[PDB]
Design an enzyme around this catalytic site. Structure first.
Site, PDB file in Angstrom:
ATOM      1  N   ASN A  97      -5.725  14.080  -9.517  1.00 50.09           N
ATOM      2  CA  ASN A  97      -5.406  12.740  -9.130  1.00 50.09           C
ATOM      3  C   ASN A  97      -5.909  13.008  -7.636  1.00 50.09           C
ATOM      4  O   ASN A  97      -5.735  13.765  -6.833  1.00 50.09           O
ATOM      5  CB  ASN A  97      -3.908  12.552  -9.016  1.00 50.09           C
ATOM      6  CG  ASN A  97      -3.589  11.167  -8.220  1.00 50.09           C
ATOM      7  OD1 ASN A  97      -4.136  10.343  -8.707  1.00 50.09           O
ATOM      8  ND2 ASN A  97      -3.060  11.249  -7.132  1.00 50.09           N
ATOM      9  N   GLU A  98      -6.723  12.098  -7.424  1.00 51.70           N
ATOM     10  CA  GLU A  98      -7.350  11.474  -6.032  1.00 51.70           C
ATOM     11  C   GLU A  98      -7.789  12.995  -5.359  1.00 51.70           C
ATOM     12  O   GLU A  98      -7.561  13.456  -4.253  1.00 51.70           O
ATOM     13  CB  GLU A  98      -6.347  10.857  -4.928  1.00 51.70           C
ATOM     14  CG  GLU A  98      -6.029   9.713  -5.610  1.00 51.70           C
ATOM     15  CD  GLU A  98      -5.392   8.718  -4.593  1.00 51.70           C
ATOM     16  OE1 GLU A  98      -4.738   9.107  -3.719  1.00 51.70           O
ATOM     17  OE2 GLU A  98      -5.691   7.465  -4.533  1.00 51.70           O
ATOM     18  N   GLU A 112       3.034   5.635 -12.804  1.00 57.86           N
ATOM     19  CA  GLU A 112       3.525   7.190 -12.166  1.00 57.86           C
ATOM     20  C   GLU A 112       5.040   6.630 -11.848  1.00 57.86           C
ATOM     21  O   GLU A 112       5.366   5.386 -11.389  1.00 57.86           O
ATOM     22  CB  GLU A 112       3.185   7.810 -11.149  1.00 57.86           C
ATOM     23  CG  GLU A 112       3.270   7.050  -9.801  1.00 57.86           C
ATOM     24  CD  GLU A 112       2.525   7.453  -8.588  1.00 57.86           C
ATOM     25  OE1 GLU A 112       2.704   8.793  -8.096  1.00 57.86           O
ATOM     26  OE2 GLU A 112       1.822   6.814  -8.268  1.00 57.86           O
TER      27      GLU A 112
HETATM   28  N1  LXE Z   1      -2.061   5.856  -2.953  1.00 61.33           N
HETATM   29  C1  LXE Z   1      -1.987   5.740  -4.295  1.00 61.33           C
HETATM   30  C2  LXE Z   1      -2.713   6.440  -4.786  1.00 61.33           C
HETATM   31  C3  LXE Z   1      -2.015   7.497  -5.490  1.00 61.33           C
HETATM   32  O1  LXE Z   1      -2.712   8.160  -6.613  1.00 61.33           O
HETATM   33  C4  LXE Z   1      -0.780   6.819  -5.971  1.00 61.33           C
HETATM   34  O2  LXE Z   1       0.284   8.237  -6.384  1.00 61.33           O
HETATM   35  C5  LXE Z   1      -0.421   5.790  -4.824  1.00 61.33           C
HETATM   36  C6  LXE Z   1       0.349   4.483  -5.262  1.00 61.33           C
HETATM   37  O3  LXE Z   1      -0.398   3.807  -6.030  1.00 61.33           O
END
Ligand code: LXE
Ligand SMILES: *[C@@H]1O[C@H](CO)[C@@H](O[C@@H]2O[C@H](CO)[C@@H](O[C@@H]3O[C@H](CO)[C@@H](O)[C@H](O)[C@@H]3O)[C@H](O)[C@H]2NC(C)=O)[C@H](O)[C@H]1NC(C)=O
Ligand SMILES: *[C@@H]1O[C@H](CO)[C@@H](O[C@@H]2O[C@H](CO)[C@@H](O)[C@H](O)[C@H]2NC(C)=O)[C@H](O)[C@H]1NC(C)=O
Ligand SMILES: *[C@@H]1O[C@H](CO)[C@@H](O[C@@H]2O[C@H](CO)[C@@H](O)[C@H](O)[C@H]2NC(C)=O)[C@H](O)[C@H]1NC(C)=O
Ligand SMILES: *[C@@H]1O[C@H](CO)[C@@H](O[C@@H]2O[C@H](CO)[C@@H](O)[C@H](O)[C@H]2NC(C)=O)[C@H](O)[C@H]1NC(C)=O
Ligand code: CL
Length: 627
Positions: free
Chosen positions: A350-351, A23
């Site tokens: 993402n996450e 990213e």
């Molecule tokens: N905290 C990490 C997890 C997140 O998706 C990324 O943008 C960050 C750095 O690799």
């Protein structure tokens, strides 16, 4: 330890096992992989008539600069212009400079391509040369080129000039400049927009990538590239999320966006440049789509998702669609790539473990729709595996872990206890980031690693032997972050660092490279390492050649002997190659010592029995031929 190597493979090693996670973070995109040398090149996403709007830009002499909301902007996407005014009674060299991303490497072996758009907002009798170039930050001109312009040019006009330095600069403290004669120019105003300075690019791509960084990524033999994030996908608000369509087409038509790491993204590194890079390196994408959450905490309600789902469909259609069947696929054709690109894997958000209350309905609506349009794509869920329970059942999860070097060797059996029930795992982010179990994300003073160390790389390598052994279910694994501009860091440690002039390959980079370049298609079961121990190994074999790759991680402070027994094979080569990465536990490759720790290659004696002493804090690859 005696390690017996089974001749019979237990499973086929995925082609995708080792790859990259990208990213725009630490100026990895703008300022990094993307070759553009001017920072704030088009005044994107800044407040007019402020100091921040002029970031990276400086007057020469008595030049008056302001970033204006242009009454007649260069495009819809680029509403801001640099208003340049020369006071009455001026003389000599008047203009402005761009400092680059903390410098500009000025190399006499390179030709640079300078461009800008200008117009005179009010017609005038001005007649003179517009000069562009490169200077040292003392004002010592190293490259220059000029062209005649006229005050009667009131319509936006592009200037394209090559630059040839007369000398390489002794350092990167150099700037781009634009100047006019102050006497000829006295009392004139010119509006500028959409500046650009490119060096030669990787594979000579139009709008391409910075060569040393691109070559460093290709060097590591990655199989995939996960993009465009990461947090940088998400935005701080719905309106600031990454949008594919804003990253395609002419640079004039890319509005840029405020990214998730404190800086504006030009989106000059856009979807087509990503896909071109993959074509140039033989990587396949793991492509994320925005999934109705942004980092300010806002989830879209279930009844708001439909336009965002369609946009995710549009994004995938740009990559893989038949150009006769959709507008995005027709746009890919129109930009010179009628043939679809490869795309096998899409990540939904993402996450989303940060928004686990809404992800079930986001996942459900996105994956229902996308799997109906794209029956061959595998969709990856981003919540913690199986909590919360998702519908449809995810085929894949993306598992992230940031922990201590010790945690990585202690957890090399992370996947061994997993059920084999058709689910595959992507280790989409991992890194040993700190020696402090209590404050993983804190300061360097509190144990955060400024750069990968031998300790961190060897811990990671131990964990990676676990990923390879478990590669029946682990399909893909990427360190994160990949890239760091050492002058603009938001996260350490990073795999590959750089300033404007040169690249630093980390200890962890070499571990990643050693694992990825020395990987067969067959997994050969061996004596298991001690679960919780410092010493780990994984063995693969190339079915076509019999090349057999014994990867050994000693993540501890004690040298450890291994005796390999290959008695099951008909033949083992009488020699093998050893590649070893080792050094002091806390040793790092830094800007000051960028080759402190590098791998060494040698020839060793091999056969059906051989003994190797794995040094403390080492990653070792022994290659033999077996049949
Ligand atoms: N905290 C990490 C997890 C997140 O998706 C990324 O943008 C960050 C750095 O690799
Ligand atoms: C990239 O493509 C997306 C579509 O996938 C574009 O976003 C869409 O932009 C339109 C026009 O601004 C939005 O419609 C407008 O919505 C507002 C607010 O409700 C309304 O006041 C207007 O009358 C109009 O209907 C649409 O909501 C929006 N869709 C999404 C999913 O965001 C986007 O503009 C494109 N970007 C570029 C640079 O072309
Ligand atoms: C100033 O830049 C111009 C424009 O890039 C250079 O002229 C070009 O040179 C290339 C290589 O010879 C040619 O293929 C282009 O056709 C030329 N274009 C034009 C418009 O002339 C020129 O060489 C540069 N001069 C200096 C001193 O660097
Ligand atoms: C594959 O096996 C995993 C274990 O590796 C199963 O996970 C369980 O899933 C249920 C809900 O479906 C959860 O409530 C449990 O907590 C999960 N177990 C663990 C240890 O996480 C998973 O469901 C299986 N998947 C399929 C497709 O069969
Ligand atoms: C960008 O970062 C580099 C590397 O950290 C800086 O160069 C270092 O500066 C420190 C502090 O002054 C010196 O002690 C080091 O010896 C320098 N290292 C190298 C390898 O040159 C550089 O100053 C930064 N650039 C800007 C504009 O801040
Ligand atoms: Cl530790």
């Amino acid at each position: 330890v005696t390690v017996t190597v089974n001749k019979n493979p237990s499973h086929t090693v995925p082609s995708t096992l080792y790859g990259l996670m990208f990213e725009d973070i630490n100026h990895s995109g703008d300022g990094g992989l993307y070759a553009e040398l001017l920072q704030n090149r088009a005044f994107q996403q800044v407040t007019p008539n402020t100091a921040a709007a002029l970031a990276a830009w400086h007057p020469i002499s008595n030049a008056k600069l302001a970033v204006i909301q242009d009454p007649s902007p260069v495009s819809n996407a680029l509403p801001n212009s640099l208003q340049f005014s020369v006071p009455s009674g001026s003389s000599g060299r008047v203009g402005f400079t761009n400092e680059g991303f903390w410098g500009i490497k000025v190399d006499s072996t390179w030709t640079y391509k300078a461009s800008l758009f200008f117009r005179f907002p009010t017609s005038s009798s001005f007649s003179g040369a517009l000069t562009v170039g490169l200077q040292t930050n003392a004002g010592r001109v190293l490259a220059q080129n000029s062209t005649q312009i006229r005050g009667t040019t009131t319509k936006w006009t592009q200037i394209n000039l090559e630059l040839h330095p007369t000398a390489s600069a002794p350092d990167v403290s150099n700037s781009f400049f634009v100047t006019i004669d102050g006497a000829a120019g006295a009392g004139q105003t010119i509006n500028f927009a959409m500046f650009s300075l490119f060096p030669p690019t990787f594979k000579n791509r139009p709008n391409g990538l910075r060569a040393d960084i691109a070559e460093t990524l290709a060097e590591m033999g990655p199989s995939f590239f996960r993009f465009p994030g990461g947090n940088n996908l998400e935005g701080q608000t719905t309106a600031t999320r990454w949008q594919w369509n804003a990253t395609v087409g002419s640079l004039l038509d890319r509005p840029g966006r405020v990214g998730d790491w404190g800086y504006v993204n030009t989106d000059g590194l856009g979807l087509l440049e990503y896909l071109q890079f993959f074509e140039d390196t033989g990587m396949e994408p793991i492509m994320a789509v925005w999934a109705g959450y942004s980092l300010g905490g806002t989830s879209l309600a279930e009844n708001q998702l439909a336009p965002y789902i369609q946009q995710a469909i549009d994004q995938i259609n740009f990559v893989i669609g038949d150009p006769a069947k959709s507008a995005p696929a027709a746009l890919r054709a129109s930009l010179g790539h009628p043939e679809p690109f490869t795309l096998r894997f899409v990540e939904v958000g993402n996450e989303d473990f940060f928004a686990a209350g809404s992800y079930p309905y986001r996942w459900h609506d996105f994956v229902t729709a996308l799997q109906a349009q794209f029956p061959q794509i595998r969709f990856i869920a981003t919540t913690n595996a199986w909590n919360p329970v998702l519908s449809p059942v995810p085929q894949s999860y993306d598992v992230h872990v940031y922990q201590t070097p010790t945690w990585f060797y202690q957890n090399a059996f992370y996947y061994d206890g997993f059920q084999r029930n058709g689910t595959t795992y992507f280790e989409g982010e991992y890194a040993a980031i700190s020696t402090n179990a209590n404050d993983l994300f804190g300061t360097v003073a509190d144990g955060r690693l400024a750069f990968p160390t031998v300790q961190s790389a060897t811990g990671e390598a131990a964990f990676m032997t676990g990923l390879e052994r478990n590669s029946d279910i682990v399909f893909a694994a990427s360190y994160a972050p990949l890239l760091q501009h050492v002058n603009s860091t938001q996260w350490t440690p990073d795999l590959v660092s750089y300033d404007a002039g040169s690249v630093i390959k980390s200890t962890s980079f070499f571990a990643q490279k050693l694992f990825a370049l020395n990987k067969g298609d067959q997994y050969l079961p061996s004596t298991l390492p001690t679960n919780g121990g410092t010493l780990h190994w994984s063995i693969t074999r190339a079915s076509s050649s019999g090349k057999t790759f014994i990867k050994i991680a000693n993540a501890g402070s004690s040298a450890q002997s291994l005796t390999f027994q290959l008695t099951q094979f008909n033949s083992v080569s009488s020699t093998g190659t050893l590649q070893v990465l080792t050094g002091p536990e806390t040793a790092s490759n830094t800007p000051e010592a960028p080759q402190a720790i590098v791998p060494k290659t040698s020839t060793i004696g091999t056969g059906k029995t051989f003994t190797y002493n794995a040094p403390a804090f080492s990653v070792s690859v022994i290659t033999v031929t077996t049949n």
